[PDB]
Every structure is written in C-alpha cells, then in structure tokens.
Amino acid sequence: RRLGVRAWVKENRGSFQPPVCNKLMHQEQLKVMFIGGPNTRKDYHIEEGEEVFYQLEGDMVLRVLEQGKHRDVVIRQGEIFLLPARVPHSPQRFANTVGLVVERRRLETELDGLRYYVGDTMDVLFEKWFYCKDLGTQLAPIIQEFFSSEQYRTGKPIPDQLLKEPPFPLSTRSIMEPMSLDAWLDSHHRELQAGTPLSLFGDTYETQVIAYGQGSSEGLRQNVDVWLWQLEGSSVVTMGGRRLSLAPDDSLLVLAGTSYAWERTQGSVALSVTQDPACKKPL
Ligand SMILES: [Zn+2]
C-alpha cells in the first residue's frame, strides 16, 4: 500500500509524455494524478470541485479566467497552488516535467465543462458539458469534435450550439499566488513541531491540505479518501491491523471507510490531502 512518490513516478516514467500525458496514482473518491508534457492547448476546463496543483519536476503555466480577465498563473518546481471551484482553467505543460494534480470524484449532480474562446476574448467559440467519471477519456472526443467543427475552421461560434447560460455561476474569486511548499513548511516549523497541524490554504476552500509535525492522530471512518505524504523524517500508520512505516517521500492512501492511527516522530513533516464534497462552498 505504501508508495514512494518519486519511486512511483520513475516506474511510470513513460506515461508522462504524449499521447496521454497522465496516470492516476489513486482513482476512487480522491483523484491523485501525475501529469507530464509537452501539452500546449486552448481548452478551458470548468468543474464544481477544486484542484490542487504541485510541481514535482519543472515548471508549468495554468491559464485562468479570473474576474473577467485572462491571467497566466506560473507554477514553478516545488510550488503548490489551490484552484477554487468553477474557475475556467487551461493547463500548459512542457517536455520532461511532472506535476501532481489532486481532484475528486464528482457528485451525481455536478457537471464538468470544456470551453474554447474566440481569440483573446471572453466570448465562447465552442462548449460541451458532461457528467465526469473519467476526465481525460471524456475530454479526448470533445477536443477531436472541436478540431473538426465549423467553429474551429471559421473562428466564429454557432449560436444554437451555445448554452443560454452556464449550468452554475462561474467563480467570482481572486486567484491565489502559488507558493514554495518547502519555504512554507520551514517558515512554520515552530508551530508544526509544537504539535499544531496547519492548513496550507485555510477555511475559505473545500479542500484541506494539512501539514503535520511531531504528534499523534486518530483517523475515523469517513465517506472520503485521505492521501498522506511523508515529506521529511518518518512516521507510522496503524491501519487494518498492520503497522506501516512511512519513510521520507512515502505516501499512503487511506480509503473511505477505513480507520487509522498515525504516530509522527520529532522533526518529521507530512501532508494529508482531503476533498470532502460535504465541505463544498455555497453561493
Ligand atoms: Zn481541471
């Protein structure tokens, strides 16, 4: 069950380049995916859940539509960033890079969208909305459809092929600045090692990425998955009658409906990643 993150990336190296630049490490309630390049594109993904971006190897550019403006969000190696719900985003990836993206299984009620815009404007050229189960797989025919369309050929939209309005309001939020994960962890070393687990992004998001130093934790049975990633030092997770030693860079997925006990050593640093749909933000 324990997976060394860079060891898993090495074993699956060939997956992080064209034609399919991604491989899911975990694919149940929590989608833990690793993506490579090159992949330069104009499609904008829209979803009701949030997306955690971390650059393991090399840099990437996340193009976003923020408060009526086009913005390029540069995410450098070692940087972490959280995208809120319903923000249109277009990830740009380069050769020999590896990024981690964390997203969640959609609720039966949630719709995903894919949009292409007219030139550099906010006018929609082409769009398709769908119920997402396996994103990359469902996106491929929509993209092929776009490249075969009158819309792509002419650069002009077909009004009858556009929705009157999106199925939900698009985000009105200001987009955060990506931050160095290591710099953030070192700056909060005193609070972390005093036994205070800390949320990287706070309570205004559904997602909870929490940093832990030395201490004890009890994981209760939840209807959501939890991904643990040991960054520095070691810890021990007691789960399903087994004691699993997490060495530096080891990760463990705690499946929904499983309880655990976590014992972290002095000077150790680890993360937990949770995207509980019950924590979805209103408005
Ligand atoms: Zn996305």
Swiss-Prot record:
Residue sites binding Fe cation per the record: 45, 51, 89
Chain residue ranges for the region called Domain A (catalytic): 1-158
GO molecular function: 3-hydroxyanthranilate 3,4-dioxygenase activity; electron transfer activity; ferrous iron binding
Enzyme class, UniProt record, top EC level: oxidoreductase
Binding site for O2: 41
Record's subunit section: Monomer.
Protein name (record): 3-hydroxyanthranilate 3,4-dioxygenase
